[PDB]
Structure formats: structure tokens, C-alpha cells
Amino acid sequence: IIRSSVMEAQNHFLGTLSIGNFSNEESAPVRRAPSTYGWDIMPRLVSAGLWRDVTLRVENPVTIVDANWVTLSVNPKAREASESLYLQTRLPFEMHDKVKAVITISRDGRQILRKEALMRKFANLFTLNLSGVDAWWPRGYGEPALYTAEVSLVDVTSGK
Amino acid sequence: IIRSSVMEAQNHFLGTLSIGNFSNEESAPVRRAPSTYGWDIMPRLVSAGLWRDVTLRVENPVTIVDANWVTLSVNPKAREASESLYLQTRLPFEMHDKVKAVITISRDGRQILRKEALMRKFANLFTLNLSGVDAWWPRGYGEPALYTAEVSLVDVTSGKIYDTKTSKIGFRTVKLELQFQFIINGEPVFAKGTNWVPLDALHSRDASHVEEAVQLMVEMNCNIVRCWGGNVYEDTHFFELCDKYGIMVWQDFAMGGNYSQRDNFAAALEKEAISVVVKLRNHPSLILWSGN
Amino acid sequence: SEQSLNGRWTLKFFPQPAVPVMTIEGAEAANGIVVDAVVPGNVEIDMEAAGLVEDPMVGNNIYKLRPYEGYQWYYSRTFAAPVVTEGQRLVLHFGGIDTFAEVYVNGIKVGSADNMLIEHDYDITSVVKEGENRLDVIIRSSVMEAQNHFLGTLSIGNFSNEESAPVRRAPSTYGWDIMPRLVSAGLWRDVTLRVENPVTIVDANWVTLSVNPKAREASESLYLQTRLPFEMHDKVKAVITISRDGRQILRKEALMRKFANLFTLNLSGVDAWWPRGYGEPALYTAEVSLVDVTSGKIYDTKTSKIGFRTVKLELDGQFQFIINGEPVFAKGTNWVPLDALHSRDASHVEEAVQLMVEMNCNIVRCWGGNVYEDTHFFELCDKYGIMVWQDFAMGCGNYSQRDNFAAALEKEAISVVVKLRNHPSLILWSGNNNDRVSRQVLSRVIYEFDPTRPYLPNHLWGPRGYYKDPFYTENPSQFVSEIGYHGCPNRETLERMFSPDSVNPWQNGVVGMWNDEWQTKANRIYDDKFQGGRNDLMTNQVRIIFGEVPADLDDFIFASQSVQAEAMKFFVELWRGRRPYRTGIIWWNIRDGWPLLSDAISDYWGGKKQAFYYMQNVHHDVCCLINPAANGYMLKVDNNTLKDFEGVVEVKDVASGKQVFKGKFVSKANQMSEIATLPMQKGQGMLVISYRIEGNEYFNHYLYGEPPYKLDQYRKWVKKCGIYEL
């Protein structure tokens, strides 16, 4: 059950600086795209609705909450790089020491690197020192080299 | 049902810097005038009660929430000035595009400017470029020129007036040059005036002292007054008289003298500071806020 | 009246289900095991007494406690509700709940605890009843509580565990290189019942405004906050008494007109508090009472021992402490956990402080990886004149910038600061650049609740190579706060903490390879098998000084403890010898908190390594020592007092017996004085330093030459020097 976005603005008292800008005063207290209220390059079409996918997801008690990949360093000449993985998971205590993280860097099915490590705590940092990997470049300055990075939480006994 | 102000202070644990000052420790965690607990120029009389008016108000669905008048620029020689109106209203969506804002700047019945605009959103900035208007000065440097500013919300079909807000504003600019100096309308002014203290330990009688007490400053030829932070905030009539008589107002917040750095006191003070600023930011006599 | 709820309780424990148990009903309905428990205590102590776990101090038994990190703990007991008069208050005081618990009194929840490091007081006046009452505490898994939070990138990958970052517990309990992983749980400090009067003292905050030692005067401020019913206003008086041994110094009476008051007390005939060496640790009993003006009935009384001193952190680790106007040279140790099961900390405090008194430390840094020590620790430091540098409880990592963590840290900081701000020994708070925690939350608490002490928003470990390398000898830090060197513990400790087949360290008899139990005692946090690592510091530092690692265990202990003793003594002589530029050295550390292999100089069971005795001889108020010079050496005497002294010094070569120097010296107060240049000796050997001051003999030494030395020759030089045992 969706309400009127425009009428929501009147639940707030605006400060002086929020009045008189090219952005609409209706947009100041709400978290919506400002151009929806009208702009010199967009029509006023406030609209409403479920504008992106709606899904149902089934998760296990052991699940990956977030996989954060970070480049510490890159050496394009040596075709090397150091990539960190900041991994956060949900992990029932009975699953501590009984689950492992399986980390794979690959390129078109060819495995570049595989690292496995036992999950002894819910959050971990894994640093990967990679060889034979090309750097990512914007157009003109080189090739936009990409690599498939995969992480899985695998039971050490059943392989689940 | 009012309870004891003194006993309320024992619901707070005080920091060291709030213990041992001139203002009472009972004053540190409560939003009251510190002078009610006693000072060297005021007795100890905490008191209680409904010390200002109690009214019942009926508002239409279309009503003016706030009319904020701001002097953008002023040209005393050419008798010109740019004034801004930051208008916020309650506006049912059915009344969108069906109400207009009517703005009238007048003086002694003589219309200076009239502007109409269709209300398409609840909040708007209107800019007025006025001609044939004089600037507002403190005493000595010019006349305390005032103009009536009126804003009304009118049904575009029936002409029904849903709300009207009226006040007297002054066209003036104020700057502080920083051990400082005030700059009114681009001219450095010399300040000479008194510190305003509580008009009465029983503050419900303050409103009856205002007229005669401001006259004292008029006969004195004060051009500035500093409202002391140990006192309450004065009501609207005090600032209206300071507008009429060209007396600049230095407004302290109601501090006394160090206070809590924690979240609860900061939320109570922000609530008060927003209420007082919105109430008084349209008076040309007001020139400076101070943390005190 | 205070009534102790300590003693025998009932403890039921069980694995924590996916939905944590939080109600009395859920606790009694769960499948678990019931055993008797002792309060204060730790759940592993009760379990070991019940024969359910094995001694975690021995072998690899620490790893067997791992499953209990996912358990819940249900404490239970009954008490007799005290008599309460109209207006009085009944308070249930917890000195330490570890950690996330729901507290119930007579089926009514009275509080939700969530901080291991501070007290928790609950007003239970209206929920108690006549006859037997019921106290039930239901603790949850601390480790699992971490998964209720989403961590920022900075909180992942540090030496401190990711499980520690969102929770307010001692970081070292999750495992450290000097502490075992032993999360534990329980009521680890006192549980008491307190009756308060409607007229009571909330807080008594003693602040020293000024001190005049020569005139024996001081100005003390009393910031008093009280609860006072209004019909008690102008009818109660405060009775402020400052005394020493019964002899009174001040009696001031003031009529209580408001609930909070600042009383300024200008005192005469009072001596100032000083750290060790710089004077006496003069303390005075400060007593404040609320007394009825008519009946003389005393409603409350707060008594403590205060000290009159001023502290200023003078920046130029480029800083020096200014105590009572004099620049003091700090020498002391870092203070680490006293026990992995912190309910036994109170039983160790007195003997552990005695280690520092005999060492002659004038300062101690309470490491942020540990809990905050209780009041008795600071009372002893006040009594023995040991300055206390207190970290807030955060180890080696980065923390959340969000509101919920800031609120929990603020509440903790207000609690501990108000608790400790009246101890004269306390001299500094430390947060341990855009960080909200260390540059806003903690600094705002010190700003409002302790403007009298400096707040600090240096550490020489590094490669840990030869102790004479320029990493140490040319570090320009005037004040160092961490520096240490490995030393193998005494044989008697090795035989007590290792299995019989694991006392000898060498895996498969290969010198340099450690068996699995020694690896566990590294400490190793998780049971993960590997060779090398932290233990290799012992063999690497032995090989640098003596060429090779001895295979015989006794020879290895002596070689390792000799390298630690020479290195640590060298660091202290290097900072004492380069005054006035060097302002202080806080070394690491004096005592283990668990039977382990470490860089401490005395183990958990009180076994002092050779470093303790070497250090003791370079920690005197006035110490003669030798520092290397351009060509040759330099005999110096360092004075860490405000008094001049005179003496005679003699330096001889131990092997040949030749005299190198003999003469008289004056040691001017609070400075380093150069006595004489000493000519370059040939080859390797040891010089003995003998000096006499006020009819008392003192001994030091200097090892000359360059490594590697021969172990048996160095052992001959020590025995012929006659100072230390072997």
C-alpha cells in the first residue's frame, strides 16, 4: 500500500536553504530521484510502483552476507596483483571449524588460483597474491581485463 | 499538572564543568531562565504556572505554516531593495493549482507592490524587487523605516481567503566585521545601549512592563540592546517596539556557565533554538545571535 | 547496609539454539547440565570443579574449551530481601557480568546487560517481596552476538578478532599472541545488595587545583552530587573531613541548600603525592557525610584516600610528564591480563603489584587489550606511588563510526572515568585521525567528566633483531611505551605446563623445531598445525648473540634468558643514559597472564626469569651504568629523584681483574651525569660496576665486544661477576 510522495513533504518543516533551489522543495525531505519532480531535461512525472524485481530467496543458516574484493596492488609489467577478500558470513557456532571457504579466480574456465581455508570465525580477510594476471584499464589506456572471482562455503565432510 | 522544577534536576548526572558556576546547578539540565534560581541582580524566585497566553485556534486545511522575510539587498540612495519571502504552507493536493498566494507590501495604506502567484507546491521562494522604499536604520543613522508585509492564500475560483499573515518588516543588511564592528546597510555604526535583564522575577508581568521599559531606551537614545542570556526570550511585542524605535537587538540564547555535551541536552536545545529563531528571524531590529 | 550475594549458586549450561534463550521459562525448559557454581567465578572454573573439563593451563587443553563458546549460562540463587523503610532504595549491584545477559528478580526482568567491563546497578525496590526472593541471570553466547552486526572494511583483518569489534569485552579474551583464546562467561565480580537512603551521595569527585609542597599547602575541590528530597533541603549538612592516621587536617561543615555543590578546601600541613623516587606517596583519608542538622542522623558516608598532586603532559612519543611542576622520567611496565579467567584477577593483584614495587617502577600502562582493573589495584598504586597510564579497552584494530557503537562506548567511558578519576596514581587516559571513536566519543567524555588529566588520542617491536641495531639505538622516541624481548620460562614452569613428553622443545630432536605443545604456548589462537612462527624469536635471538642454539634444555633456558636480560637492561640503560632528551621507557612486560612462552620477564606462576634481576639493578633511584661511546665506553650515573647524592664507583674487568676506573661522583638531582670516559677494552668480556651511596652497595655490569659470544664463557663471566645466579 503506497502513499503519495508529494504529500509526504508536508510532514517536514523546511530550512531556508532547502527553499528556492532548482530542485523541488517536495524532493528535499524524501529519498527519491530529484529529477522525477521535474527538471529542465526531464518532465515532471512523480509516478509510483514496484519499479524493480520482486523475488523470494531461500538461504541456509550458513550463508555469505557480503564478499568485498579490494585491489591492494597491481603490477602490469609483471602481470601480478594482490587482491584482498573481506568476507562476512552467517555461521551457526556448530558450523565453526566444520565449514571452509573455497576461493577461485579464473578466466574463461581456466583456473588462475584456488585458495581454501577453514572457517573459524564469521568474518575473515583473505589476501591473494596472483601471478599471470593482467590489469584493468579504461578505454585507450589498455584492455579492460576482467576475472571471475568466486567464493563458496563448503562443508568439509559432506561437501555441501 | 506541573511538577517541581528543582527536583527535576536530580534526574540528571552533572559533569564537573556544570558544578560550581554562578548559575545554579539546578539550572544546568533544565530549559528555564537561569536567573529564576537567583543572581546578583535578580532574586531567587523559581515560581511556576501558565505565564503567557493560552488560546484556542482554528486553522483551515489551507494555511500558512511560516512566512520568512529576508532582505537580499538594499540601496538607500536609489530607494530600492530586494526582499525574499520563504513561504511554507499546508496544502491539500486537491487545492494544488486551485489556490494563489497574494503578497502585498504597503505603508499607511499606500500600496508599494502587489504580487500574485499560483500555488503549485507547498513551499516557494518569492523574490520582490521593490522601488520607492526606504531603508531601516538604527537610531541616529536614519529613520526606522517599516513597511507592512501581508501574504494571503486565496481560492482562485471563489476568492475565499484561507489564511493571512501580516507583520511589519524592515529592509536592511547586517554584517559583523571581525573586537568587531557592526555594519548596517554598508555603513559602520557605533553601538551605544543597555543590557536587557528580566523585567520581573514573576515573568507573567513582563508583558505589562515592556512599553514603559522600551521608552526608557528611547529617551536614553540607545541604538542597541543586548538581551541577557539569564533572562527569558522576550515576546513579539518587544521586538516590534525595537523595530519601531530603531534599537538593534543582540539576542543571547538562554544559557547562563558550561553545560552538557551529551545527546539529550543537545536535542532539547536544538528544539528551543529552532523555535526561537523561526519566531524572531523576521524582525529587522534583531542583528546578532550569541552563544553566551 | 550491604549484603553480599556472593557464594554458592546454581549454573545450568547448554548449547545456544538458533533463537537465544532469554526467559526464565526457556531456561528451565532447555536440555542442559546443572552444576554448583561459585560467585565471583568463571563457568570453566565451576565446570573443572565438577570434573567436566580438564585443566586448560596444561598442554593443548585450552583448545578443548572451544565448544563452550556457543553455550548459554543460567545462574540461579535465592536471597532474603532486606527490610526497607519508606523512601529507601534497594539496589542490586553487579560488579561484572560477562556479558550479554537478562537479569530477573522474582520473574520480573530488571535489566539487559551488555558490557563486560563496567558495573550494572538495578533498582529492584518495587519488584522484591517478603521472604525468599529469586535471582536468575541468563547469559548468551558472546561470539554469536557478533553476527548481529555488519562490519566495516576497517574492522576486518586486524590482529584483534572480528568477533571483538562490535562488542564491549576485553579484546585479549578472543586470543592474542600473549593470551590464550578463552572467551568464557559468568559473574566475574561481586554481586551485592545495597540499601540507600532518600538522602544519599551520588558521587564525590576530588580534584587537586594546586599544590605547594614547600609550604605544605594544597587546594582541593570537592564536587559533590547527592539525592536530596526537597523537604530535606536546608535541613541536612555535609561533613567534610581530611585526615591522616587519625590526626585531623580539615573539618568543614556546610548546609545543604542544593543537590550539587562545589566545596573549595584550602589546606595547610599537607604533603604532596609523588611517584617513586621523586618523593613520598602521601595519601589522606577524605570523608564526606550527609548529616541531619537536628537529629545528627548520618544518611550516607563516602570515604577514600586521595592525593594532592598536579599532572601535565608536556609535548615537545615526544612528551614528558610534569608532576607537581617537576619533569619526571618514567620507568615502568605494561600491565596485561592477570588471568584468562578474570574472576581470579583480584586474587593476583597484591602479589603482582609487589613485582612492580620491588622492580621500582614509577609508572604502569594498563594495556587496552585487558579489562579495566578494579579499585583495589588503583588503591595499591596510590599507596606505592606508581603512576597509572590507562588505555580505554580497545586492542589493535579499527572500529565502527556509527551511532550504536558510539553510544555503547560513551556509556562505558562515563562509567570508568567517574569510577577512577579520584585516584592520584592515575595520570593519563589513552584512546589506543578522522576516527570518531578516538577523536570525538572518548575526548568528549574526558572533556565533561575529567578535565584534570591529559587525554592521548612509541612502540618498538619491528624486526626484533639484534638489540643494538639502529632500529632501537637510533629510534628518536623520547618516550617509548612498548619494547620487549623473548625469554624462555624457567624449567619448573615448563615441566608444570607441558606434558612429560613435551617438556623438551625439539620436535623429533631437531634443534630449532618446536613440538606441538610449545606451538600452542606461543600463544597459538586456533588449533592449526604448522612449524615456525612466533616461537622462532627465541632461537633467532639466541643465534645472534651466541652463534648457535644449544641442544640441552638447561643450556637453552640460560642462553635465552641471558639474551632477554641483556637486551632489556640495554634498552633501559640506553634511555636513562640519554637524558634529558629521553623522557621515559615503558617496557613490555612484567608478568604473564597465563602459563605461556612469552617476552615477559616473569611467568604466571611467579617464576622470575633472569631479566627480572638484571632490570632490577638498572631501575634504582640512582644507578651507575655504562653506555657505548665513539671510541670506548662512558660511565654515567642517572638520578630519578629530587635529591643530590655522592658516592664512589669502581669498574673492573671480570676476567683479568684489572681496574678500569675508580673515583668519586656527585649525582645531581633528576638528571644524567657523565662520570668518566672508559678506554676501549680488547676482545670480548665483561666489566663489573660497583658503587656505594650512603653506606649501601650497588652492582651493575657491562658486556663489551661484539656478538657472537661463547655461551660457556659468558656463563663464566656472570659467575665470576658475582651479581646474579645461574
Reduce the secondary structure of chain A to three states and give it as a string.
CCCCHHHHHHHCCCCHHHCCCCCCCCCCCCCCCHHHHCCCCCCCCCCCCCCCCCCCCCCCCCEEEEEEEEEEEEECCCCEEEEEEEEEEECCHHHCCCEEEEEEEEECCEEEEEEEEECCCCEEEEEEEEECCCCECCCCCCCECCCEEEEEEEECCCCC
Q: Give chains near A: 3+ CB pairs under 8 A.
A: B, C
**Radius of gyration of chain B from Cα atoms?**
21
Q: Hunting for cell 666489566 — which residue is that? A: C687
**Strand arrangement, sheet containing C217-227:** C200-212, C217-227, C260-268
Q: Is the dihedral of CA B154, B159, B161, B164 positive or negative?
A: positive
Which residues have C-beta within 8 Å of that of residue C26, sequence separation ≥ 6?
C138
**Chain C residues near residue A84 by CB distance under 8 angstroms:** 157
The dihedral formed by the CA atoms of B267, B261, B40 and C238, expressed in degrees to the nearest 10: 120
Give me the half-sphere count of Cα atoms (radius 13 Å) on the Cβ side of residue A141: 5
DSSP type of residue B134: P
Please count the residues of chain C. 726
Instruction: Locate the chain B residue with the closest alpha carbon to C443.
Output: B261
Contact (CB<8Å) B70/A16: yes
CA-nearest of B216, B185, B194, B219 to B287 is: B185
The amino acid present at B14, given as its one-letter code, is: L
Q: Do B24 and C258 touch (CB under 8 A)?
A: yes
Closest CA to C424 of C384, C479, C391: C384
CA–CA separation, C77 and B90 (whole Å): 61
C-beta atoms of C230 and B6 within 8 A: yes
Phi and psi for C510 in degrees, rounded to 5? -90, 115
- Rounded Cα distance, B116 and B150, in Å: 12
Q: 585443566: which residue's cell?
A: C55
Strands B286-290 and B248-252, how do they pair? parallel
Residue whose grid cell is 536471597 = C79
**CB count, 10 Å around CB of B63?**
16
Distance, in Å, from the CA atom of C667 to the CA atom of C676, rounded to the nearest integer, reads 13
CB contact under 8 A, A93 and C156: no
Report the C-alpha gap between C370 and C361 in whole angstroms.
20
| Chain A positions in Cβ-Cβ contact with residue C141 (cut-off 8 Å) | 93
What angle in degrees, to the nearest 10, is found between the helix axes of B206-220 and B236-244? 20
Q: What angle do CA C645, C646, C648 make, to 5 degrees?
A: 140
Q: How far is Cα C207 from Cα B100, in angstroms, rounded to an integer?
A: 66
C242 burial level (CB within 10 Å; 0-12, 13-18, 19+): buried
What is the strand order of the sheet A148-155 is part of?
A: A110-118, A99-107, A148-155
Residue of C nearest to B10 (CA): C227
Nearest CA-CA partner of B251 in B270, B225, B223:
B225
Backbone angles phi, psi at A27, to 5 degrees: -85, -20
d(CA C653, CA C656): 6
Under 8 Å CB-to-CB from B190, ≥6 apart: which residues?
Answer: none
Question: Cα–Cα distance between A38 and A27 in angstroms, integer?
Answer: 10
Q: Resolution in A for the shown PDB structure?
A: 2.4
CA gap C357, B34 in Å, rounded? 51
Q: Which residues contact A1 (CB under 8 A, 6 or more apart)?
A: none
Closest by Cα among C145, C148, C138, C143 to C67 = C143
- Which H or E run includes B226? strand B224-227
**Residue B63 contacts A, CB cutoff 8 Å:** no
Which of 254-273 (B) contact C at CB < 8 A? 260-262
CA C436/CA B106 separation, integer angstroms: 53
How far apart CA C11 and CA C35 sit, in angstroms, is 5
CA distances (Å), C218 to each of C211, C262, C337, C363, C454, in order?
4, 16, 36, 24, 20
Q: Look at the alpha carbons of B39, B43, B48, B52 in this order and tell me if their dihedral is positive or negative.
A: negative
DSSP C329-365: PEEEEEE--S-SSGGGSTTTHHHHHHHHHHHT-SEEE
Neighbouring-strand partners of residue C321: C313, C328
Q: Can you tell me whether residue C410 is helix, strand or coil?
A: helix
> B151 with B85: CB under 8 angstroms?
yes
Q: Strands C696-704 and C685-693, how do they pair?
A: antiparallel
Q: Residues C200, C284, C4, CA angle at the centre, nearest 5°?
A: 45
Q: Does A140 touch chain C (CB under 8 A)?
A: no
Class of residue A12 by CB neighbours under 10 A (exposed 0-12, middle 13-18, buried 19+): middle
Q: How distant, in Å, are the alpha carbons of B162, C355, C431, C673 from that of C391?
A: 64, 21, 6, 34
Alpha-carbon distance C337 to C173, whole Å? 9
Closest CA to C250 of C236, C238, C232, C234: C238
C655 sits in which H/E element: none
> Residue C574 is placed in which grid cell?
640506553
Residues of B in contact with A20 (CB under 8 A): 84, 86, 124-125
C417 contact partners, CB below 8 Å, separation of at least 6: C429, C445, C446, C449, C450
A102 touches chain B (CB under 8 A): no
* C-alpha cell of residue B37: 534560581
Q: Which three cell numbers stand for residue C697?
A: 652497595
CA distances from C597 to C61, C525, C538 (A): 16, 13, 9
Contacts of B68 in chain A (CB under 8 A): 16
CB neighbourhood size of C234 (10 A): 12
Q: What are the two backbone dihedrals, phi and then psi, of residue B85, each rounded to the nearest 5 degrees? A: -115, 110
Nearest CA to C478 among C609, C320, C349, C618?
C320
**Alpha-carbon dihedral angle through residues C503, C504, C506, C507, given to the nearest 10 degrees:** -50
> Are the C-beta atoms of B33 and B230 separated by less than 8 Å?
yes
CA separation, residue C478 to residues B27, C156, C332 (Å): 46, 33, 15
Whether the CB of C15 is below 8 Å from some CB of chain A: the reply is: yes
CB contact under 8 A, A20 and B84: yes
Among the listed residues C413, C461, C404, C458, the one whose alpha carbon sits nearest the alpha carbon of residue C438: C413
> CB–CB of C254/C237 below 8 Å?
yes
User: From the CB of residue C76, how many other CB atoms can be counted at a distance below 10 Å?
Assistant: 19
Which residues contact residue C486 at a Cβ distance below 8 angstroms, ignoring those fewer than 6 apart? C464, C537, C538, C541, C560, C563, C564, C597, C598, C599
DSSP string over C413-480: HHHHHHHHTT-SSEEEEE-----HIIIIIHHHHHHHH-TTS-EE--EE-TT---TTSHHHHT---SEE
Q: Check B26 against C447: CB less than 8 A apart.
A: no
**By the CB < 8 Å criterion, does C164 face chain A?**
no
C91 contacts C128 by C-beta, under 8 angstroms:
no
Q: Which residues is C652 bridged to in the sheet?
A: C659, C688
Contact A63, A49 (CB under 8 A): no
Name the residue in chain A with its Cα closest to that of B84.
Answer: A20
**From the CA of B11, how many Å to the nearest CA of chain C?**
9
In the sheet that holds B187-189, the strands lie side by side as: B174-177, B181-184, B187-189
Residue C155 distance to chain B (closest CA, Å): 26
Distance CA C257, CA C232 (A): 9
CB within 8 Å of C136: residues ≥ 6 apart? C24, C27, C74, C75, C76, C103, C104
- What is the separation of C-alpha B211 from the centre of its chain, rounded to a whole number of angstroms? 17
Residue in A3, A46, A10 with CA at minimum distance from that of residue A28: A10
Q: Distance between CA C599 and CA C588 in Å, rounded?
A: 7
Q: Exposure string (b/e) for B251-260, b if CB count within 10 Å is 16 or more? A: bbbbbbebbb
- Could C451 and B262 be called an inter-chain contact, meaning their C-beta atoms sit closer than 8 Å? no
Q: What share of chain C is helix, strand, coil (3-state, %, to 5)?
A: 25, 35, 40
Residues in B closer than 8 angstroms to C259, CB to CB, are 9-10, 25-26
Q: Which of C441, C384, C382, C383 is nearest to C417 (CA)?
A: C441
The vertex-B146 CA angle with B140 and B148, nearest 5°, equals 175
Contacts of A18 in chain B (CB under 8 A): 123
Strands C236-244 and C191-196: what pairing? Answer: unpaired
Element (H, E) at C562: helix C553-576
Alpha-carbon dihedral sign for residues B49, B52, B58, B60: negative
The closest CB to that of C202, out of B13, B16, B260, belongs to B13
Positive/negative CA dihedral, A90, A92, A93, A98: negative
Say yes or no: C35 contacts chain A, CB-CB below 8 A: no
Query: Comparing C-alpha atoms, which of B66, B58, B57 is closest to residue B89?
Result: B66
Beta bridge partners, B152, equal: B102, B164
Q: In a 3-state reduction of DSSP, which class is residue B204?
A: helix
Residues of B in contact with A24 (CB under 8 A): 121
CB contact (8 A) between residue C448 and residue B262: yes
Would you give the DSSP letter of residue C670? T
Chain B, 109 to 138: residues with Cβ < 8 Å from chain A are 121-125
Angle at B283 between CA B279 and CA B285, to 5 degrees: 130
Contact B166, B150 (CB under 8 A): yes
Tell me if B249 sits within 8 A of B34, measured CB to CB: no
Residues of C in contact with A61 (CB under 8 A): 18
Interatomic CA distance for residues B276 and B133, integer angstroms:
29
Would you give the DSSP letter of residue C377?
A: H
Which of B274, B194, B258, B181 minimizes the C-alpha distance to B227?
A: B194
Q: Verify cis geometry, omega within 30 degrees of 0, for the bond prior to C362.
A: no
Closest approach of chain B CAs to the CA of A32, in angstroms? 17
CB B121 within 8 A of CB B92: no
Q: What grid cell was written down for C259?
A: 543537590
Q: Does A20 touch chain B (CB under 8 A)?
A: yes
Q: Residue C662: how many CB atoms within 10 A of its CB?
A: 12
Nearest chain C Cα distance for residue B18, angstroms:
9
- Cross-strand bridge partners of residue C483: C460
Q: Which H/E stretch holds residue C613?
A: helix C610-617
Note whether B227 and B196 are within 8 A (CB). Answer: yes
Q: Chain-centre distance of CA A62, in angstroms?
A: 19
Cell 545527546 maps to which residue? B263
SS3 C194: strand
For residue C575, give the amino acid letter. Answer: W
Phi and psi at C205, nearest 5°, equal -115, 110
DSSP string for residues in C225-272: EEE--GGGTTSEEEEEEEEETTEEEEEEEEE--SSEEEEEEEEES-PP
Tell me if C207 sits within 8 A of C451, measured CB to CB.
no
End-to-end CA distance of chain C: 55
DSSP, collapsed to helix, strand or coil, labels residue C31 as coil
Instruction: For residues C80 and C89, give the distance between their C-alpha atoms in angstroms, rounded to a whole number.
Output: 16
Closest CA to C391 of C433, C343, C354, C337: C337
Q: What is the CA radius of gyration of chain C?
A: 28
Q: How far apart are CA C712 and CA C307, in angstroms?
A: 51
Identify which of C382, C341, C416, C411 has the alpha carbon closest to the alpha carbon of residue C189. Answer: C341
Helix (H, G, I), strand (E, B) or coil at C399: coil
Distance CA B208, CA C596 (A): 81
C-alpha cell at C249: 587536617
C549-582: buried (b, 16+ CB within 10 Å) or exposed (e) per residue? bbeebeebbbbbbbbbbbbbbbbbbbbbbebeeb
User: Is B25–C227 a contact, with Cβ atoms under 8 angstroms apart?
Assistant: no
Q: How far does C182 lie from chain A, in Å, by closest CA? A: 14
Cβ atoms of residues C511 and C559 within 8 Å: no
DSSP state of B182: E
CA atoms within 13 A of residue B282's CA, in its CB half-sphere: 25
DSSP letter at C160? S
Is omega for the bond preceding C158 within 30 degrees of 0, making it cis? no
For residues C341 and B123, give the distance between their C-alpha atoms in angstroms, rounded to a whole number: 63
Residue in A closest to B92 by C-alpha: A7
Per CB-CB distance under 8 Å, the chain A contacts of B123 are 9, 14, 18-19, 25-26
Furthest-apart CA atoms within chain B: distance in Å: 65
